[PDB]
């Protein structure tokens, strides 16, 4: 009432990984943008 770090640790590790997964949807990896509506509606399918 005044120690559950194992449980806390587990509950956390998973959130830190799920956030890193979403934060990758905004990297270019060597492209002109991160949005398909900027690469699509701005170029030819070729």
């Amino acid at each position: 009432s005044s120690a559950l770090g194992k449980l806390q640790d587990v509950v956390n590790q998973n959130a830190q990984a799920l956030n890193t997964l979403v934060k990758q949807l905004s990297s270019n990896f060597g492209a002109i943008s991160s949005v398909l509506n900027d690469i699509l509606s701005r170029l030819d399918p070729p």
């Binding site: 979403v22 934060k23 949807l25 905004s26 509506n37």
Partner: protein, 50 residues
């Protein structure tokens, strides 16, 4: 005016500072816009998937 997307549009209550074009959410997804003509903020909730 350039922002292409899909979803449900809803009346907002977020005070978009007179100079903020849109709303940015952690993990970087568009979640609010401002209508160019009437200049009101609208939230963009995602359609239903599963």
């Amino acid at each position: 005016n350039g922002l292409t997307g899909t979803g449900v549009l809803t009346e907002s209550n977020k005070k978009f500072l007179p100079f903020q074009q849109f709303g940015r959410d952690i993990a970087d997804t568009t979640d609010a816009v401002r209508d160019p003509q009437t200049l009101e903020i609208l939230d963009i909730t995602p359609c239903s998937f599963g």
